[PDB]
Amino acid sequence: SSQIRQNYSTDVEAAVNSLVNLYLQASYTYLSLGFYFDRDDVALEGVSHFFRELAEEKREGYERLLKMQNQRGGRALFQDIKKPAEDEWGKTPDAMKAAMALEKKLNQALLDLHALGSARTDPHLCDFLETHFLDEEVKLIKKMGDHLTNLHRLGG
Amino acid sequence: SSQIRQNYSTDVEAAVNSLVNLYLQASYTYLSLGFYFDRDDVALEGVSHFFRELAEEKREGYERLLKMQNQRGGRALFQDIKKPAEDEWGKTPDAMKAAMALEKKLNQALLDLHALGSARTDPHLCDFLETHFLDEEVKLIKKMGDHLTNLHRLGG
Amino acid sequence: SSQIRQNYSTDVEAAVNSLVNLYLQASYTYLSLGFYFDRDDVALEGVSHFFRELAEEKREGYERLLKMQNQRGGRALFQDIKKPAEDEWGKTPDAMKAAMALEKKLNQALLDLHALGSARTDPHLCDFLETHFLDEEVKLIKKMGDHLTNLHRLGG
Amino acid sequence: SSQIRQNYSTDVEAAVNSLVNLYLQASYTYLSLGFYFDRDDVALEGVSHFFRELAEEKREGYERLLKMQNQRGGRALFQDIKKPAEDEWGKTPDAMKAAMALEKKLNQALLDLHALGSARTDPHLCDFLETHFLDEEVKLIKKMGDHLTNLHRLGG
Amino acid sequence: SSQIRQNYSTDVEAAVNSLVNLYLQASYTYLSLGFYFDRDDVALEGVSHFFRELAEEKREGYERLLKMQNQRGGRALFQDIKKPAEDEWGKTPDAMKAAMALEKKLNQALLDLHALGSARTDPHLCDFLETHFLDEEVKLIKKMGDHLTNLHRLGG
Amino acid sequence: SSQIRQNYSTDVEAAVNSLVNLYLQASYTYLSLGFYFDRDDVALEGVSHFFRELAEEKREGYERLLKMQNQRGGRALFQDIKKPAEDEWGKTPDAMKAAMALEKKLNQALLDLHALGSARTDPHLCDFLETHFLDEEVKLIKKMGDHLTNLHRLGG
């Protein structure tokens, strides 16, 4: 066991590795969404930019998780990253709907990880998630909801 | 149910609405305290200012609660705001005692809301309350306690 | 009677207290309108901002009335603040129509208060209302009228 | 009971006093480590500085605990501070090993105090520890681990 | 076929997609190398930083390829990203050797892609690779070679 | 014996260690006085600050003694630090009286240490005490005397 490890569940270490994979997958999805909207037959630079910036934010997420893993004396273990669910993402609203479903999945994974830490009485992990993840997710999901509402109003 | 709503108890949504009413009521009490001290036959501008600034801080509180309500996909529901408990607030120490009793009530309402979220396993709500409310209340109550101690020393 | 009181009708003092309640109620209505438009299923930040800024302006109104009440040696008396007339405010035009009806009510209350002061030969009160209220109301109502006209043009 | 005290367990108050003693003891240990490395027959200014700065950080810790104790209406109670465990601390790696054992002790005391507050449903205390202590400890322990690894590489 | 597509081989489009996968895989390898060196029992921040910066440079690579794909009217197609070849990367020289083998693989893939474009008489593709890739690879490989030489001298 | 040691009595070395303990004890007393005055039922921030600043000055004292000990080739030896004489310090004048008694004790210890060095013909030690301690003590004691005189005038 690492010389620094203290109050860090092997279950949490593993769940952190799984969550890093989920974030790697999410960044990948946003990379695909971003370049789809840069297509000449789609051509929405603002939408492309929105998704490309999200790819970066998800990368920031998995980098923070990996840093924390090392801070706690856990050990990063990487798996294959699944390709995104679609090759073509439809119209802006279809894409935005896909994005909020992805964020809801990530948020559930965060909530599950928090519940796991709570069960293992790990307040460092709790504080980490609250500080860097939970509210970021709530804010983002609210933003996507607002977008979907406004996109729906277009044509009316 | 809102398209964004996730892990947000209807009980918490309702308790948030009730707490917004309690803050609306508290801001109202401080408005009354502030103008009482601006009376020509009371005439304590520093005390008036103290209470007027608290009215603003309680407004900031209920605005933050309402913002959070919307962020979570809950729905603001407003009720009548009860008038303050007194029309005339006595001497500075009587007023300050009324103020710390009000803050203790608010703090208990916060603690109760936190316990409710804990019971509903809502770490976003926990983080929100800890970040924006709990310590603010502790600091304020400490400040009021110190004031009461110093007011009591006057005449001695 | 206050040591400073001079040419200040008890009828005016009471009407000022009633008008403070009407402004408290109006600020409350604008708070509700503002957060309604911040809903994820409404999502119009510019409209939300418009109404939130009006809530602030109505607060400025009742604070000015209360200051004047004390300046004249009158005595603030607070009553319960009625909740807003709706929990949900419809589309932007429905909301704006509600807002101009509210402003017309306030303006009538101002005009009535002015007539009361005129009857009681209170030129200080007249000057106060003219300086801080009457033209503000006319300008605002004109702005709302212009908005309603432009909103009606949308879809055409 | 203090006029400000609310939701503050006598058990927590006592545990806070005990933790202040543990921090006083830890600052003392770092004072001794710092001056040991300033000896002419040891003469490692960078190591001396490292430990002297830790003495300061532990002082900051117990000052923050004492401030919080007063903020909550608890009452500071001081006991004798035990002298450090060694008069002479060996080579840099021996010293660093002593330091990480000390930090692990402090971290366990923090975790125990957090568990106690959780049991007493004290979210203010939770937030205080998370904000000012837990992550500071994790970061420091990680830093010490890294040092031990690098010191071990010297001679190779 | 895209409205913009001109002189762009379907073979090149496919080879570009394959090369994007190879770069995604290479960035992933560098992410793993970077966090390995941030381990408390490895603890070489300069090496960690070196590899983390390479992860970024490989991301820049695949982003440039994807941009070019769209510029030419080709269509991004994403596949699963294979996990890195090792979970633990040994000592600095083992890691650096792994890195230069990776860069040699990438460089061969670039050279192969260039040969393919040459065969398809695609001078835009040639210029793109020469401008953004070939010399970058040569410089990097030279840097890694120099590192390996210097690492080998350590202990001597 | 240290390679640097010259004209440094073992008696002086020991007396320096004892004086470091006396300063550690004095800083501890001032820490307790400082937090006592920060109590909500005492609440004198200026008095609290006065004593907290003295805690710092006594720390500066024992750090200077320890530095000098090492400069001379003596060896720091630490003992348990006795807790302060009171848990509660009364009114400001009681506290200030306690403080001047403490300073008089420290000053006597300094004077005794100076006499010891004089007996051992140690002019370096003499200069050290004169430069960093003696006049500081005289100035501080004068300041405390002035305070006691002024506190006594309050109520009159």
PDB file of N, CA, C and O in Angstrom, chain B residues 2-4 21 24 28 31-32 35-36 38-41 52 59 62-63 66-67 70 73 75-84 87, chain C residues 2-4 21 24 28 31-32 35 38-41 52 59 62-63 66-67 70 73 75-84 87:
ATOM      1  N   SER B   2     -39.275  18.787 -14.555  1.00  0.00           N
ATOM      2  CA  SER B   2     -38.368  19.566 -15.375  1.00  0.00           C
ATOM      3  C   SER B   2     -37.385  18.647 -16.098  1.00  0.00           C
ATOM      4  O   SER B   2     -36.926  17.645 -15.523  1.00  0.00           O
ATOM      5  N   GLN B   3     -37.048  19.018 -17.338  1.00  0.00           N
ATOM      6  CA  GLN B   3     -36.045  18.327 -18.144  1.00  0.00           C
ATOM      7  C   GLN B   3     -34.665  18.272 -17.495  1.00  0.00           C
ATOM      8  O   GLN B   3     -33.861  17.410 -17.837  1.00  0.00           O
ATOM      9  N   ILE B   4     -34.377  19.189 -16.579  1.00  0.00           N
ATOM     10  CA  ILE B   4     -33.065  19.209 -15.921  1.00  0.00           C
ATOM     11  C   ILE B   4     -33.013  18.523 -14.549  1.00  0.00           C
ATOM     12  O   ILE B   4     -31.945  18.295 -14.008  1.00  0.00           O
ATOM     13  N   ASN B  21     -39.601  32.250   1.981  1.00  0.00           N
ATOM     14  CA  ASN B  21     -40.548  33.034   2.785  1.00  0.00           C
ATOM     15  C   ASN B  21     -39.959  33.529   4.117  1.00  0.00           C
ATOM     16  O   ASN B  21     -40.169  34.687   4.497  1.00  0.00           O
ATOM     17  N   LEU B  24     -37.590  36.350   3.235  1.00  0.00           N
ATOM     18  CA  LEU B  24     -38.401  37.509   2.897  1.00  0.00           C
ATOM     19  C   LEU B  24     -38.903  38.187   4.176  1.00  0.00           C
ATOM     20  O   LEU B  24     -38.775  39.428   4.346  1.00  0.00           O
ATOM     21  N   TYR B  28     -37.725  41.890   5.827  1.00  0.00           N
ATOM     22  CA  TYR B  28     -38.798  42.821   6.176  1.00  0.00           C
ATOM     23  C   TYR B  28     -38.621  43.331   7.592  1.00  0.00           C
ATOM     24  O   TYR B  28     -38.805  44.520   7.845  1.00  0.00           O
ATOM     25  N   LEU B  31     -35.805  45.781   7.575  1.00  0.00           N
ATOM     26  CA  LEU B  31     -36.276  47.047   7.011  1.00  0.00           C
ATOM     27  C   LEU B  31     -36.950  47.876   8.100  1.00  0.00           C
ATOM     28  O   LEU B  31     -36.652  49.044   8.272  1.00  0.00           O
ATOM     29  N   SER B  32     -37.825  47.227   8.868  1.00  0.00           N
ATOM     30  CA  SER B  32     -38.526  47.905   9.963  1.00  0.00           C
ATOM     31  C   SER B  32     -37.559  48.373  11.068  1.00  0.00           C
ATOM     32  O   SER B  32     -37.655  49.509  11.560  1.00  0.00           O
ATOM     33  N   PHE B  35     -35.515  51.538   9.732  1.00  0.00           N
ATOM     34  CA  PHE B  35     -36.251  52.816   9.750  1.00  0.00           C
ATOM     35  C   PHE B  35     -36.661  53.264  11.150  1.00  0.00           C
ATOM     36  O   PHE B  35     -36.617  54.446  11.439  1.00  0.00           O
ATOM     37  N   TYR B  36     -36.926  52.327  12.053  1.00  0.00           N
ATOM     38  CA  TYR B  36     -37.132  52.684  13.452  1.00  0.00           C
ATOM     39  C   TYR B  36     -35.969  53.509  14.018  1.00  0.00           C
ATOM     40  O   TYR B  36     -36.191  54.539  14.662  1.00  0.00           O
ATOM     41  N   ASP B  38     -33.885  55.375  12.438  1.00  0.00           N
ATOM     42  CA  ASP B  38     -33.802  56.626  11.668  1.00  0.00           C
ATOM     43  C   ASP B  38     -34.880  57.657  12.123  1.00  0.00           C
ATOM     44  O   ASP B  38     -34.884  58.804  11.660  1.00  0.00           O
ATOM     45  N   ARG B  39     -35.774  57.264  12.972  1.00  0.00           N
ATOM     46  CA  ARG B  39     -36.742  58.148  13.627  1.00  0.00           C
ATOM     47  C   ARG B  39     -36.035  59.317  14.286  1.00  0.00           C
ATOM     48  O   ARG B  39     -35.053  59.117  15.017  1.00  0.00           O
ATOM     49  N   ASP B  40     -36.671  60.483  14.301  1.00  0.00           N
ATOM     50  CA  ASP B  40     -36.018  61.648  14.950  1.00  0.00           C
ATOM     51  C   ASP B  40     -35.931  61.475  16.465  1.00  0.00           C
ATOM     52  O   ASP B  40     -35.087  62.093  17.102  1.00  0.00           O
ATOM     53  N   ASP B  41     -36.796  60.644  17.045  1.00  0.00           N
ATOM     54  CA  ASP B  41     -36.805  60.465  18.496  1.00  0.00           C
ATOM     55  C   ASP B  41     -36.044  59.208  18.903  1.00  0.00           C
ATOM     56  O   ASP B  41     -36.087  58.794  20.068  1.00  0.00           O
ATOM     57  N   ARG B  52     -30.244  48.119   8.129  1.00  0.00           N
ATOM     58  CA  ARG B  52     -30.512  48.241   6.713  1.00  0.00           C
ATOM     59  C   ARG B  52     -29.598  47.346   5.878  1.00  0.00           C
ATOM     60  O   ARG B  52     -30.054  46.739   4.906  1.00  0.00           O
ATOM     61  N   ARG B  59     -31.952  39.728   1.650  1.00  0.00           N
ATOM     62  CA  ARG B  59     -32.421  39.721   0.286  1.00  0.00           C
ATOM     63  C   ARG B  59     -31.492  38.918  -0.600  1.00  0.00           C
ATOM     64  O   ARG B  59     -31.955  38.145  -1.446  1.00  0.00           O
ATOM     65  N   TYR B  62     -32.397  35.207  -0.046  1.00  0.00           N
ATOM     66  CA  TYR B  62     -33.528  34.636  -0.729  1.00  0.00           C
ATOM     67  C   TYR B  62     -33.343  34.656  -2.239  1.00  0.00           C
ATOM     68  O   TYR B  62     -33.769  33.731  -2.908  1.00  0.00           O
ATOM     69  N   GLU B  63     -32.613  35.641  -2.780  1.00  0.00           N
ATOM     70  CA  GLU B  63     -32.283  35.606  -4.208  1.00  0.00           C
ATOM     71  C   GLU B  63     -31.400  34.403  -4.574  1.00  0.00           C
ATOM     72  O   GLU B  63     -31.598  33.771  -5.611  1.00  0.00           O
ATOM     73  N   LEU B  66     -33.626  31.253  -4.542  1.00  0.00           N
ATOM     74  CA  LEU B  66     -34.462  31.218  -5.742  1.00  0.00           C
ATOM     75  C   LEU B  66     -33.665  30.839  -6.998  1.00  0.00           C
ATOM     76  O   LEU B  66     -34.135  30.061  -7.851  1.00  0.00           O
ATOM     77  N   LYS B  67     -32.457  31.380  -7.122  1.00  0.00           N
ATOM     78  CA  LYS B  67     -31.580  30.993  -8.209  1.00  0.00           C
ATOM     79  C   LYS B  67     -31.286  29.487  -8.186  1.00  0.00           C
ATOM     80  O   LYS B  67     -31.350  28.818  -9.226  1.00  0.00           O
ATOM     81  N   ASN B  70     -34.253  27.281  -9.255  1.00  0.00           N
ATOM     82  CA  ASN B  70     -34.296  27.191 -10.711  1.00  0.00           C
ATOM     83  C   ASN B  70     -33.166  26.350 -11.293  1.00  0.00           C
ATOM     84  O   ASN B  70     -33.397  25.589 -12.228  1.00  0.00           O
ATOM     85  N   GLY B  73     -34.234  22.771 -11.110  1.00  0.00           N
ATOM     86  CA  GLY B  73     -35.483  22.464 -11.784  1.00  0.00           C
ATOM     87  C   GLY B  73     -36.692  22.497 -10.881  1.00  0.00           C
ATOM     88  O   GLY B  73     -37.769  22.081 -11.294  1.00  0.00           O
ATOM     89  N   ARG B  75     -39.523  24.806  -8.522  1.00  0.00           N
ATOM     90  CA  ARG B  75     -40.426  25.861  -8.937  1.00  0.00           C
ATOM     91  C   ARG B  75     -40.785  26.739  -7.771  1.00  0.00           C
ATOM     92  O   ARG B  75     -41.341  26.270  -6.749  1.00  0.00           O
ATOM     93  N   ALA B  76     -40.415  28.012  -7.900  1.00  0.00           N
ATOM     94  CA  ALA B  76     -40.687  28.994  -6.889  1.00  0.00           C
ATOM     95  C   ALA B  76     -42.174  29.137  -6.672  1.00  0.00           C
ATOM     96  O   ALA B  76     -42.936  29.253  -7.632  1.00  0.00           O
ATOM     97  N   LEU B  77     -42.569  29.105  -5.405  1.00  0.00           N
ATOM     98  CA  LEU B  77     -43.943  29.375  -5.014  1.00  0.00           C
ATOM     99  C   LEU B  77     -43.903  30.328  -3.849  1.00  0.00           C
ATOM    100  O   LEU B  77     -43.300  30.024  -2.810  1.00  0.00           O
ATOM    101  N   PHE B  78     -44.561  31.468  -4.036  1.00  0.00           N
ATOM    102  CA  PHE B  78     -44.530  32.577  -3.087  1.00  0.00           C
ATOM    103  C   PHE B  78     -45.811  32.633  -2.258  1.00  0.00           C
ATOM    104  O   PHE B  78     -46.892  32.365  -2.768  1.00  0.00           O
ATOM    105  N   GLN B  79     -45.660  32.967  -0.985  1.00  0.00           N
ATOM    106  CA  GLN B  79     -46.783  33.180  -0.077  1.00  0.00           C
ATOM    107  C   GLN B  79     -46.713  34.584   0.486  1.00  0.00           C
ATOM    108  O   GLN B  79     -45.725  35.328   0.264  1.00  0.00           O
ATOM    109  N   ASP B  80     -47.801  34.981   1.145  1.00  0.00           N
ATOM    110  CA  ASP B  80     -47.825  36.256   1.846  1.00  0.00           C
ATOM    111  C   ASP B  80     -46.637  36.345   2.800  1.00  0.00           C
ATOM    112  O   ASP B  80     -46.237  35.348   3.456  1.00  0.00           O
ATOM    113  N   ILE B  81     -46.077  37.546   2.887  1.00  0.00           N
ATOM    114  CA  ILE B  81     -45.002  37.827   3.852  1.00  0.00           C
ATOM    115  C   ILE B  81     -45.567  38.488   5.100  1.00  0.00           C
ATOM    116  O   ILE B  81     -46.065  39.609   5.045  1.00  0.00           O
ATOM    117  N   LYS B  82     -45.462  37.805   6.240  1.00  0.00           N
ATOM    118  CA  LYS B  82     -45.947  38.348   7.500  1.00  0.00           C
ATOM    119  C   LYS B  82     -45.187  39.607   7.890  1.00  0.00           C
ATOM    120  O   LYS B  82     -43.965  39.686   7.738  1.00  0.00           O
ATOM    121  N   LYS B  83     -45.927  40.570   8.424  1.00  0.00           N
ATOM    122  CA  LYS B  83     -45.341  41.783   8.934  1.00  0.00           C
ATOM    123  C   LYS B  83     -44.433  41.477  10.134  1.00  0.00           C
ATOM    124  O   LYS B  83     -44.549  40.431  10.783  1.00  0.00           O
ATOM    125  N   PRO B  84     -43.509  42.391  10.428  1.00  0.00           N
ATOM    126  CA  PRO B  84     -42.616  42.191  11.558  1.00  0.00           C
ATOM    127  C   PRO B  84     -43.371  42.177  12.889  1.00  0.00           C
ATOM    128  O   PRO B  84     -44.486  42.705  12.982  1.00  0.00           O
ATOM    129  N   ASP B  87     -43.860  47.017  16.010  1.00  0.00           N
ATOM    130  CA  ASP B  87     -43.871  48.285  15.268  1.00  0.00           C
ATOM    131  C   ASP B  87     -42.786  49.213  15.824  1.00  0.00           C
ATOM    132  O   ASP B  87     -42.268  50.088  15.117  1.00  0.00           O
TER     133      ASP B  87
ATOM    134  N   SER C   2     -44.397  64.279  16.934  1.00  0.00           N
ATOM    135  CA  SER C   2     -42.960  64.421  16.802  1.00  0.00           C
ATOM    136  C   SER C   2     -42.557  65.886  16.962  1.00  0.00           C
ATOM    137  O   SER C   2     -43.272  66.787  16.491  1.00  0.00           O
ATOM    138  N   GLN C   3     -41.399  66.103  17.596  1.00  0.00           N
ATOM    139  CA  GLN C   3     -40.798  67.425  17.751  1.00  0.00           C
ATOM    140  C   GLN C   3     -40.519  68.133  16.428  1.00  0.00           C
ATOM    141  O   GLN C   3     -40.408  69.356  16.399  1.00  0.00           O
ATOM    142  N   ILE C   4     -40.387  67.382  15.342  1.00  0.00           N
ATOM    143  CA  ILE C   4     -40.103  67.989  14.036  1.00  0.00           C
ATOM    144  C   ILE C   4     -41.329  68.214  13.141  1.00  0.00           C
ATOM    145  O   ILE C   4     -41.247  68.894  12.133  1.00  0.00           O
ATOM    146  N   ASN C  21     -46.707  49.778   1.467  1.00  0.00           N
ATOM    147  CA  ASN C  21     -47.222  48.418   1.257  1.00  0.00           C
ATOM    148  C   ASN C  21     -47.443  48.069  -0.225  1.00  0.00           C
ATOM    149  O   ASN C  21     -47.094  46.965  -0.661  1.00  0.00           O
ATOM    150  N   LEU C  24     -43.996  47.536  -1.703  1.00  0.00           N
ATOM    151  CA  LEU C  24     -43.516  46.247  -1.231  1.00  0.00           C
ATOM    152  C   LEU C  24     -44.156  45.119  -2.047  1.00  0.00           C
ATOM    153  O   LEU C  24     -43.455  44.204  -2.553  1.00  0.00           O
ATOM    154  N   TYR C  28     -42.356  42.588  -4.906  1.00  0.00           N
ATOM    155  CA  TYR C  28     -42.569  41.151  -4.733  1.00  0.00           C
ATOM    156  C   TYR C  28     -43.044  40.524  -6.028  1.00  0.00           C
ATOM    157  O   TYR C  28     -42.586  39.443  -6.393  1.00  0.00           O
ATOM    158  N   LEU C  31     -40.120  40.333  -8.341  1.00  0.00           N
ATOM    159  CA  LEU C  31     -39.261  39.220  -7.934  1.00  0.00           C
ATOM    160  C   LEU C  31     -39.784  37.920  -8.537  1.00  0.00           C
ATOM    161  O   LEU C  31     -39.039  37.162  -9.133  1.00  0.00           O
ATOM    162  N   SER C  32     -41.094  37.709  -8.418  1.00  0.00           N
ATOM    163  CA  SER C  32     -41.725  36.507  -8.973  1.00  0.00           C
ATOM    164  C   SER C  32     -41.627  36.458 -10.510  1.00  0.00           C
ATOM    165  O   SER C  32     -41.302  35.412 -11.095  1.00  0.00           O
ATOM    166  N   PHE C  35     -37.864  35.578 -11.531  1.00  0.00           N
ATOM    167  CA  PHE C  35     -37.492  34.157 -11.401  1.00  0.00           C
ATOM    168  C   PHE C  35     -38.298  33.231 -12.308  1.00  0.00           C
ATOM    169  O   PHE C  35     -37.748  32.282 -12.838  1.00  0.00           O
ATOM    170  N   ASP C  38     -36.399  32.959 -15.493  1.00  0.00           N
ATOM    171  CA  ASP C  38     -35.137  32.237 -15.269  1.00  0.00           C
ATOM    172  C   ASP C  38     -35.358  30.695 -15.197  1.00  0.00           C
ATOM    173  O   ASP C  38     -34.391  29.927 -15.125  1.00  0.00           O
ATOM    174  N   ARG C  39     -36.575  30.256 -15.189  1.00  0.00           N
ATOM    175  CA  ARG C  39     -36.950  28.845 -15.299  1.00  0.00           C
ATOM    176  C   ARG C  39     -36.293  28.212 -16.511  1.00  0.00           C
ATOM    177  O   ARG C  39     -36.356  28.774 -17.616  1.00  0.00           O
ATOM    178  N   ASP C  40     -35.935  26.937 -16.413  1.00  0.00           N
ATOM    179  CA  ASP C  40     -35.303  26.277 -17.584  1.00  0.00           C
ATOM    180  C   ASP C  40     -36.293  26.095 -18.733  1.00  0.00           C
ATOM    181  O   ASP C  40     -35.882  25.972 -19.880  1.00  0.00           O
ATOM    182  N   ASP C  41     -37.592  26.075 -18.435  1.00  0.00           N
ATOM    183  CA  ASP C  41     -38.596  25.856 -19.475  1.00  0.00           C
ATOM    184  C   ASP C  41     -39.203  27.173 -19.944  1.00  0.00           C
ATOM    185  O   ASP C  41     -40.189  27.181 -20.691  1.00  0.00           O
ATOM    186  N   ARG C  52     -36.199  41.727 -12.743  1.00  0.00           N
ATOM    187  CA  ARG C  52     -35.393  41.816 -11.545  1.00  0.00           C
ATOM    188  C   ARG C  52     -34.943  43.248 -11.264  1.00  0.00           C
ATOM    189  O   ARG C  52     -34.941  43.676 -10.108  1.00  0.00           O
ATOM    190  N   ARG C  59     -38.099  48.698  -4.799  1.00  0.00           N
ATOM    191  CA  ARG C  59     -37.506  48.753  -3.486  1.00  0.00           C
ATOM    192  C   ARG C  59     -36.960  50.136  -3.198  1.00  0.00           C
ATOM    193  O   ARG C  59     -37.141  50.657  -2.092  1.00  0.00           O
ATOM    194  N   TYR C  62     -39.982  52.302  -2.159  1.00  0.00           N
ATOM    195  CA  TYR C  62     -40.485  52.230  -0.812  1.00  0.00           C
ATOM    196  C   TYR C  62     -39.449  52.690   0.202  1.00  0.00           C
ATOM    197  O   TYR C  62     -39.810  53.307   1.189  1.00  0.00           O
ATOM    198  N   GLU C  63     -38.153  52.503  -0.080  1.00  0.00           N
ATOM    199  CA  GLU C  63     -37.125  53.072   0.798  1.00  0.00           C
ATOM    200  C   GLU C  63     -37.163  54.608   0.820  1.00  0.00           C
ATOM    201  O   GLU C  63     -37.003  55.225   1.872  1.00  0.00           O
ATOM    202  N   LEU C  66     -40.208  55.683   2.928  1.00  0.00           N
ATOM    203  CA  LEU C  66     -39.922  55.502   4.351  1.00  0.00           C
ATOM    204  C   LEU C  66     -38.965  56.572   4.895  1.00  0.00           C
ATOM    205  O   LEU C  66     -39.146  57.093   6.012  1.00  0.00           O
ATOM    206  N   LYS C  67     -37.943  56.908   4.113  1.00  0.00           N
ATOM    207  CA  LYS C  67     -37.053  57.990   4.484  1.00  0.00           C
ATOM    208  C   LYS C  67     -37.813  59.313   4.650  1.00  0.00           C
ATOM    209  O   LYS C  67     -37.606  60.038   5.632  1.00  0.00           O
ATOM    210  N   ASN C  70     -40.002  59.491   7.811  1.00  0.00           N
ATOM    211  CA  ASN C  70     -39.182  59.886   8.952  1.00  0.00           C
ATOM    212  C   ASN C  70     -38.743  61.344   8.898  1.00  0.00           C
ATOM    213  O   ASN C  70     -38.740  62.015   9.925  1.00  0.00           O
ATOM    214  N   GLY C  73     -41.541  63.402  10.283  1.00  0.00           N
ATOM    215  CA  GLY C  73     -41.953  63.055  11.632  1.00  0.00           C
ATOM    216  C   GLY C  73     -43.112  62.090  11.689  1.00  0.00           C
ATOM    217  O   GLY C  73     -43.662  61.866  12.763  1.00  0.00           O
ATOM    218  N   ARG C  75     -44.646  58.064  11.102  1.00  0.00           N
ATOM    219  CA  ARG C  75     -44.228  56.819  11.713  1.00  0.00           C
ATOM    220  C   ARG C  75     -44.606  55.649  10.847  1.00  0.00           C
ATOM    221  O   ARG C  75     -45.801  55.430  10.536  1.00  0.00           O
ATOM    222  N   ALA C  76     -43.576  54.928  10.408  1.00  0.00           N
ATOM    223  CA  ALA C  76     -43.753  53.769   9.579  1.00  0.00           C
ATOM    224  C   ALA C  76     -44.568  52.720  10.296  1.00  0.00           C
ATOM    225  O   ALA C  76     -44.301  52.409  11.457  1.00  0.00           O
ATOM    226  N   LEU C  77     -45.571  52.202   9.596  1.00  0.00           N
ATOM    227  CA  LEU C  77     -46.359  51.081  10.083  1.00  0.00           C
ATOM    228  C   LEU C  77     -46.486  50.094   8.954  1.00  0.00           C
ATOM    229  O   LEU C  77     -46.995  50.435   7.876  1.00  0.00           O
ATOM    230  N   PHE C  78     -46.030  48.875   9.222  1.00  0.00           N
ATOM    231  CA  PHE C  78     -45.936  47.815   8.223  1.00  0.00           C
ATOM    232  C   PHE C  78     -47.074  46.807   8.376  1.00  0.00           C
ATOM    233  O   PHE C  78     -47.477  46.491   9.488  1.00  0.00           O
ATOM    234  N   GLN C  79     -47.579  46.333   7.246  1.00  0.00           N
ATOM    235  CA  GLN C  79     -48.590  45.280   7.204  1.00  0.00           C
ATOM    236  C   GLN C  79     -48.063  44.112   6.399  1.00  0.00           C
ATOM    237  O   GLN C  79     -46.973  44.185   5.777  1.00  0.00           O
ATOM    238  N   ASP C  80     -48.793  42.999   6.477  1.00  0.00           N
ATOM    239  CA  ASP C  80     -48.475  41.840   5.658  1.00  0.00           C
ATOM    240  C   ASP C  80     -48.396  42.249   4.189  1.00  0.00           C
ATOM    241  O   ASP C  80     -49.189  43.092   3.693  1.00  0.00           O
ATOM    242  N   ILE C  81     -47.445  41.643   3.489  1.00  0.00           N
ATOM    243  CA  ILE C  81     -47.316  41.835   2.036  1.00  0.00           C
ATOM    244  C   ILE C  81     -47.982  40.691   1.287  1.00  0.00           C
ATOM    245  O   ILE C  81     -47.536  39.549   1.364  1.00  0.00           O
ATOM    246  N   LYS C  82     -49.036  41.001   0.532  1.00  0.00           N
ATOM    247  CA  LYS C  82     -49.737  39.991  -0.247  1.00  0.00           C
ATOM    248  C   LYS C  82     -48.834  39.385  -1.311  1.00  0.00           C
ATOM    249  O   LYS C  82     -48.063  40.091  -1.968  1.00  0.00           O
ATOM    250  N   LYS C  83     -48.970  38.078  -1.490  1.00  0.00           N
ATOM    251  CA  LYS C  83     -48.258  37.376  -2.526  1.00  0.00           C
ATOM    252  C   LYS C  83     -48.710  37.861  -3.911  1.00  0.00           C
ATOM    253  O   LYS C  83     -49.793  38.436  -4.074  1.00  0.00           O
ATOM    254  N   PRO C  84     -47.870  37.641  -4.922  1.00  0.00           N
ATOM    255  CA  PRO C  84     -48.224  38.054  -6.271  1.00  0.00           C
ATOM    256  C   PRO C  84     -49.440  37.292  -6.802  1.00  0.00           C
ATOM    257  O   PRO C  84     -49.757  36.200  -6.313  1.00  0.00           O
ATOM    258  N   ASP C  87     -48.725  32.541 -10.014  1.00  0.00           N
ATOM    259  CA  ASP C  87     -47.518  31.744  -9.758  1.00  0.00           C
ATOM    260  C   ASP C  87     -46.747  31.546 -11.067  1.00  0.00           C
ATOM    261  O   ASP C  87     -45.523  31.357 -11.067  1.00  0.00           O
TER     262      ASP C  87
END
